[PDB]
């Protein structure tokens, strides 16, 4: 009339619980998952004796362990993650030019480029769930990782994704604490003026794709209206991410690590991944083609960095 | 010496002018010697061509053939693999909605009225479905690449099928205002919006009444070869052998993707060119189609 | 147990006395019930309703007959759809324009005004008494009954796309066109000459050309062989002809025609205007009136006077 | 031998850029697609009067792209094109005032734009893109033609194309500042159990499935994956208005009980929206026409209610 079972939010803590066998797991735990399967409407069939189930964080020690694993506190995180996972484990993640990609499915082009970029920049995620899923994605098993990205960005399977917005969300969960970007500008009405940026904001700029153009200054307007020049004074980070609204722009081999291109219906668009290895490579989900140069609508280009002073 | 047509049945003899002109969905307007005795399409710019066009497509819109050819330029480059015995469409240009419709039409008994459609459908059933798809786009006023709604698409297409043998009778009761029995015919006899479950439609569903109370609507009589039930996408469970086929939609109104579920020996999910078999299927369903001949409560 | 006597009707001619419990709504007792076009199904009777007449739907074998002989439709849904249409058409304006009753634009109704304006310009007689009555009332500036009836007969709802050509065919089926006959000949070089005879609606509508003289001089059409045949009018016995074709730029010359209909705008949710030839050309566009020496436009249907003709 | 004027080009019409035009080359060749007050001038020879006039041009360089990302909050390269094409038609529309609001006399199947436009003057809304916000003020003042063109292009709809009020409010609401809006819902199934979900932003102000906000407070039936009918209700709602939509159905509006609603006559292909607002009594605004009524019965499809902060009992 009862069965012994375990419930967890992070798959490591496993609190014991005694289940009625006359009630549904849902009646007892709220929404409940057995190996990704939604068993909320189900009554114990023995079998589960000894098994472990995923629950949403109902009590206060569950919310703690969940925050410590996912570094979020949204009650609806475990469930949006499983909603998306029901579809992501059905995708197929082939290796492409050494890297783990995703074949087209459910308008995921922006996820495949996002994931191919993450494997070329050196980045380590604080939240234990992310880093574990990120290592498994590197091994060809990126289903958990993709379902985590969708959940961290508040996106459902199939919605329109935006690479810059997707990476902005993830980079806040990445260990970018030690990244410094220092910017100075010439007379507005102030001659010189100096600012400093830290963390996620240090490695991200909207407005121009050319890292060198950014090094050598960009003329942006100033408080009175005089077109001053912003220039990269110093930079300390493992990479930088230059974005800009999309236009015909030319990817010159050996001048950037990787980049993303957006084509097709603007509202439900398509993304392609451009990476520079021996020659320029275009990774398109599962379709790989090589070329000496590239021209297309480029949104966001990725470059590697150690330290920079001008 | 060539042939200009609008419908491919009636050839007008020419020598070589025509206006916007097509040979196999390529815009050869702004331009040989191997084009001898080969048919060309053109836009109807005379009363004889407009009547030929009306008779063949069942449209009087001057732009139909235009948009037909425009769409066909892309759909000729789509692939149409055979999947589980049906013609489907390799994903491209956000066409999942066209694939699901296409896979549904083969599984339900339907007769199109306009010669263009019935002939294009037979080719699609044979594997050459570029014309059928391009007709659907033009009938629905959609361009390649635009996102599409399967419920919308079937409504447009059913407008062009013989469904006047299909009769549906419904009963509604509110506690204050009594009963109202209504007879629906044609397209409204096969399409219902509000719920996915056919059995629940027979047993009553709660809908609002101007009264203010919730009334309850149920199916009294039904004469048709199939029915189609729709509702906003929502997690829903499909059980082998209780339905004919169904559509799943991931995402939202701006950008999403359809897949197709069919019930054979086991549940098969067709996702364009890919097929995965399944003992059960749950996901966000939006349309379910059921076999029918004659039901009376 | 308060009660009153009231009348229930399907046609507002044959009235049936009923006694109604006042503790029960009209809906419980009759089904859908109306009082001068207003849904009163949810309400219980008042003292004041007393010998008033109420509209119901056909809910017994005897009522289904009165509806048939009055509307010439067996379709059970017909009276309910007419009432729903009437909720909005009673709200439409029916101003006079140039001796004719028209309809101020509303609810994508441009096709109904062209249809109505045409009907007051051609001799025609409807069989269904309901239609005939609504028509007379239409001429008198009270066309709401008529519009609701056309909608019902054409299975369209308020605001939907209408089609002047579909609309008129529907109606003509409800007109006495038995004294109308047309004869045509098709001569193909390969196949020969065959004559067919047309009786009824088929006799007064052609779908190939807006030009009635052309139909007399012959028009080219497909032939079962493959060659363009030529079909021409040998004789026409009818009060009018309606010539229709897919819309094209086309010139309406003064005095050569009774009236036409123009179709513009988004083809999927389009606009119609009415062209009628009097002392000058008059383009009636709902409430607005224009007057011109000539007219070029995308004409969709042309109406012509006719009594008898032999080529 | 040579002739030139000085025009301004812009993307936002705030950052004017001084340009000398070779009066031997159409604005097109010099600038690319160029517009004057929504009129395409790509391939028209310049004029001598065209001096000092502000010209709109496509963003064809990094600086303008960013001037235009800050202004329209969209990076779609066709935005200006679609905005100007709409604009050239919406400047020809009439903007009569009905009942103190800016409406639109009917043309080009614009009824859905008028209802939306009337609705946006009665609900507390703030837009994030300066372009919508800037046009919004002008629209209230009585000059709404620029606003209407922006709506058209933010929604990817063209003049004359049939529109859907609910679809358009959704698009526009994504550009509203709605992060201080929060909705807590609770679903209860006899079999499957209890689950509470929270919504923010647009998802907190729009609900589809019922017209009545009071039912939503009291409980609406919806299918559950178990197969039973579950019950959902408003635990906690916090926003200045709420929006309730249902597929159009005969339904009664009652004075004082709401802010405004939309009536729809037609089907999925051709249709007409009307507007209803609750002031001293009910007012049906049909573009230009105004007609009064004590109570309103018709095919309602969207209802708007005012809100402050509501927590269930
Ligand atoms: Zn200054
Ligand atoms: Zn009721
Ligand atoms: Zn022949
Ligand atoms: Zn349940």
Swiss-Prot record, chain B:
Zn(2+) 6 binds at residues 174, 177, 209, 211. Residues 1-42 form the Ubiquitin-like domain. The active site is at 96 (for pl-pro activity), 257 (for pl-pro activity), 271 (for pl-pro activity). Changing residue 51 to A: Partial loss of ISG15 cleavage in vitro. Residues 56-297 form the Peptidase C16 domain. It is found in: Host endoplasmic reticulum membrane. It comes from the Viruses. Changing residue 62 to S: In strain: Omicron/BA.2.75. LRR repeats lie at residues 102-124. It is a multi-pass membrane protein. Changing residue 60 to A: Partial loss of ubiquitin cleavage in vitro; no effect on ISG15 cleavage in vitro. Inhibited in vitro by GRL-0617. It catalyses: Thiol-dependent hydrolysis of ester, thioester, amide, peptide and isopeptide bonds formed by the C-terminal Gly of ubiquitin (a 76-residue protein attached to proteins as an intracellular targeting signal). Changing residue 130 to D: In strain: Alpha/B.1.1.7. A zinc finger (C4-type) spans 174-211. Responsible for the cleavages located at the N-terminus of the replicase polyprotein. Participates together with nsp4 in the assembly of virally-induced cytoplasmic double-membrane vesicles necessary for viral replication. Antagonizes innate immune induction of type I interferon by blocking the phosphorylation, dimerization and subsequent nuclear translocation of host IRF3. Also prevents host NF-kappa-B signaling. In addition, PL-PRO possesses a deubiquitinating/deISGylating activity and processes both 'Lys-48'- and 'Lys-63'-linked polyubiquitin chains from cellular substrates. May form homohexamers. Interacts with N protein. This is Papain-like protease nsp3. It comes from Severe acute respiratory syndrome coronavirus 2. The gene is rep. The chain holds residues 1569 to 1875 of 7096 of the full protein.
From Swiss-Prot, chain D:
Changing residue 145 to D: In strain: Alpha/B.1.1.7. A zinc finger (C4-type) spans 189-226. Residues 71-313 form the Peptidase C16 domain. Signal peptide: none annotated. Changing residue 232 to Q: In strain: Gamma/P.1. Changing residue 66 to A: Partial loss of ISG15 cleavage in vitro. It is a multi-pass membrane protein. Residues 2-57 form the Ubiquitin-like domain. Changing residue 75 to A: Partial loss of ubiquitin cleavage in vitro; no effect on ISG15 cleavage in vitro. The active site is at 111 (for pl-pro activity), 272 (for pl-pro activity), 286 (for pl-pro activity). Changing residue 256 to S: In strain: Omicron/EG.5.1. Zn(2+) 6 binds at residues 189, 192, 224, 226. It is found in: Host endoplasmic reticulum membrane. Changing residue 75 to L: Increased cleavage of ubiquitin in vitro; no effect on ISG15 cleavage in vitro. LRR repeats lie at residues 117-139. Inhibited in vitro by GRL-0617. It catalyses: Thiol-dependent hydrolysis of ester, thioester, amide, peptide and isopeptide bonds formed by the C-terminal Gly of ubiquitin (a 76-residue protein attached to proteins as an intracellular targeting signal). Changing residue 4 to I: In strain: Kappa/B.1.617.1. Changing residue 77 to S: In strain: Omicron/BA.2.75. Responsible for the cleavages located at the N-terminus of the replicase polyprotein. Participates together with nsp4 in the assembly of virally-induced cytoplasmic double-membrane vesicles necessary for viral replication. Antagonizes innate immune induction of type I interferon by blocking the phosphorylation, dimerization and subsequent nuclear translocation of host IRF3. Also prevents host NF-kappa-B signaling. In addition, PL-PRO possesses a deubiquitinating/deISGylating activity and processes both 'Lys-48'- and 'Lys-63'-linked polyubiquitin chains from cellular substrates. May form homohexamers. Interacts with N protein. This is Papain-like protease nsp3. The gene is rep.
